[PDB]
Design a binder for these strands. Structure first.
Ligand SMILES: [Mg+2]
Length: 47
RNA sequence: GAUGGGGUUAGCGCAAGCGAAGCUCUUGAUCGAAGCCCCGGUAAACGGCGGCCGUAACUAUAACGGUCCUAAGGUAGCGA
């Protein structure tokens, strides 16, 4: 099962190259309560 | 042609010599323009239009950066 290498024709280091493409992104939690937190409509919504 | 330095000298002295005046060879003081230097301009005047090193999500490149040098570092376009 392939991954479409955003980098393409990988010549030198495969690991490093991959780590520098969308597959190993910087992933950020959308936490509640604080900063970058507010949701207009919740997961289940207002009742 | 300023001065200075001679040079033979009417001579005077008993004489080494001083060497009147004048004569006269020099010395170039001063006077003294253009140009040159110098200041600015001009490249459709003649001409000239850089190096070295480092750098970005594999690699590669380097928009970018450091530095040195220049009068300035080749712009548009074009380009084995
Ligand atoms: Mg050919």
């Amino acid at each position: 099962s392939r991954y479409q290498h955003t980098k393409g024709q990988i010549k030198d280091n495969a690991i490093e190259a991959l780590l520098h493409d969308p597959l190993f992104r910087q992933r950020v939690e959308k936490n509640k309560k604080g900063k970058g937190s507010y949701m207009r409509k919740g997961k289940h919504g207002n009742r």
